Structure formats: structure tokens, C-alpha cells
Symmetry: D2
């Protein structure tokens, strides 16, 4: 599993559970092709999105549905979602972990890429 997502709730100090995540791949016509998706687990994680075979070089977009998450908690949020757009490059480490720390009016994301 070369692509992982770890989402944290900076308000409650807990993993962000049941957050919808959609991954897209940029197509030849510059549109976003659905690639993979899921809901974060009780540990705020989402793995098994793709395989080494399928995760070829290219531009990918990871959309985290933060708005629905905050609405479920009864908290008015700012963003429609958090977007993480990046290029997968074979000439570097294999495993991509996208960290995302969520607050109603702020989010931070950090990519950790390793072997």
C-alpha cells in the first residue's frame, strides 16, 4: 500500500473517524479521474486505497470531506473540503503518507514519503 492517509481532529484531540476520502488521478484531458476512495477508520487512517501496480507516476488529488465531518459534530466549518494535490515520482521513496490535521477554520497537511 503505497498511499496512506492519516486524519486528525485538532478540536477533540482524536483521530478523525468516518471521514470520506476520494482520490483522483489527472487524465490526459486534464480532468480528474476517480481512482480510489474510502472512509477513515477508528484510528483516522485509510489504507488499501491502491497497489504498487496501479499507483503509477502522475498527478493525484486527495480530497478529504472535512465539511461533512464538522457538520456531524455540530460545528460550522469554513472549507468545503481539504485538497492535497501532488505528483507521484518513481525516483523517490515508495510509501506516501498524507497527514491532515483538521480544525473548523484551518487545516494543515504534511506528506511523509519513505521506503
Amino acid at each position: 500500500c503505497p498511499l496512506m492517509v492519516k486524519v486528525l481532529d485538532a478540536v477533540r484531540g482524536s483521530p478523525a473517524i468516518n471521514v470520506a476520502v476520494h482520490v483522483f488521478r489527472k487524465a490526459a484531458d486534464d480532468t480528474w479521474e476517480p481512482f480510489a476512495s474510502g472512509k477513515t477508520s477508528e484510528s483516522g487512517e485509510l489504507h488499501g486505497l491502491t497497489t504498487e501496480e496501479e499507483f503509477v507516476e502522475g498527478i493525484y488529488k486527495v480530497e478529504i470531506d472535512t465539511k461533512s465531518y464538522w457538520k456531524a459534530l455540530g460545528i460550522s466549518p469554513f472549507h468545503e473540503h481539504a485538497e492535497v494535490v501532488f505528483t507521484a515520482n518513481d525516483s523517490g521513496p515508495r510509501r506516501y503518507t498524507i497527514y491532515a490535521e483538521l480544525s473548523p477554520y484551518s487545516y494543515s497537511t504534511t506528506a511523509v514519503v519513505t521506503n
Copy 2:
């Protein structure tokens, strides 16, 4: 200015200067219509993007072109850009300041929304 952007460079401890920013507004067909664009100043600030009159209700996307910024500094960063997508002015006119703090493999964005 109802729409403002403040960008900081967390590697150099300075405002992020000459960063290109493109703003889009969602149309009916889910496509992103260009709304406004500019580049950050020496203070990492970008005002004069729009006016209260033109900045109507809608879903807006503020795209900060961080990749170019880092490459010019000799750094190969992770993200293509930093995207900030939000509904604006749905409860009346508001003033928005989008803060962004950039690192090659990380960014944070915080929105300050005030009622004039």
C-alpha cells in the same frame, strides 16, 4: 478588500513573495470559472483581488501556486499547489483573509472571517 491572502515561508522565516494566486468561482456545471488572480507582494500579501459588489455568494477556490515558489528556491516540493475551497457570503457580505504557511512537504491554511 473582502478577499485577502497572506502567505508565509516557514523555511526562511519571511513572507512568501511573488507567489501566484488564482481565484475561481464554481459555476452551474461544476466547472471552475476564473474569478481573479494576482501575485503576493513583499509582505506576502495580496489585496485588490475583487470588490464587495463582484464578490457575490458562491463556492470559491483560492489556488496558491506553491510549486513554482519552491522550485525557484532550488527546492523540489511535494504539492502542485495549495487549494483553499470555501463557500463565501452565504449569510451576507464578509471579509476573508486566507493565511497560508508553506514548507516544501507541508502547508497549513487558516481563514479569518470578519463581519464589516
Copy 3:
């Protein structure tokens, strides 16, 4: 002002108002001597802490009293405070702006350092 602090509330999307800030400077015995204090304004800003003359070389600690801030909003936060410790003016006088973005279980701080 050579020392400035800008604090934002990432839960409400606003400046963090009336946040107490204490600045200390390290002495010889590793103890923290009180240097200056204040509270953030409506803009989440705090200037007038010190002067160029008084702000000599040294190791400074900017302590932001976030716990009190969150408790007053009905939130029980994780941190006692947000501490920002740094060497200042060791290469001559500089201007420092300490940005802080607060959430109940998280905070970020970014320093902008400029040469006047």
C-alpha cells in the same frame, strides 16, 4: 516594534482576542527573567512589548496563555500554554513577528524575521 505577536483562533475563524502573553529572557543561571507582558487586541495583535534599545541579544521565551483562552470559550484544551523559545538579535537588531494558530488540541507557530 521589534517584537510582535499575532494569534488566530482556528475554531472560530477569527483573531484570538484578550490572550495573555508573557515574554521572558534567559539570565545566567538558566532562570527566565520576566521581560515584558501584554494581551492581544481585537486584531489578535500585541505590539508595544519592548523597544529596539531594550530588546538586546539573548534567548527569549514568548509564552502564550492559550489554556485560559479556551476555557473561557467553554473548551477544555490540551496545552497549558504555547511556548516559543528563540535566540534574538545575535547578528544585529531584527524585527520578529510570532504567528500562532490555536486549536484546543493543537497549535502552530511561525516566526517572520525581517532586517529593518
Copy 4:
């Protein structure tokens, strides 16, 4: 292990390895008593700092030696270190994970507290 630390390098997009971490406990006389310490692993983690028996309620300080980390990489940093000060409370979740994302002139820290 009720206390864990996960440190990430936001410049290189990798765990922050070999970062010294010192944990202190606030004593009756308001001074900081050394409690535990170590160096982050190849995964930027530091566990086995303490036990449930020893990790009683009280105020703790986690000092991350970020200055030495950046100096090793030949990068001039701003902070002397990153400090995370908090109260351990029995009336909540047991495991504390302190996340820290490091940049030369910025750091973010997020606490994740779970069962």
C-alpha cells in the same frame, strides 16, 4: 506506553530521525523534574518513555531538540527547541501521542489522546 511522540520533517517529507526528546514533570516547588528521554527512531517515533504506573496525573513538558536537528542538516533554524506542556488527566483516554511537524521557522504540534 501511555506517552508517545511522532516527529516529522516538513522540509524533507520524512520522519525526523535522531531528534533528542526530553520529558519533564512539574514538581511541588514548580521546577521541571527530568522524567524520561530518548532519541527518535528511523520512523520519527519515541515510545517506551514511561509506564502506566509512573505516568500519574500532573503537568508534563515535552522538549523536542529541534535546533540540533536543523543544524545537523545545515539549515539555520529559529527555535531553540519545541515545547509541549500539558496536564495528564486520568478522567480521559489513556494513550497520549504528541505529533510535531517541524520546519526551520515554524512548528506545529497536535495531541491525539485515545483508548
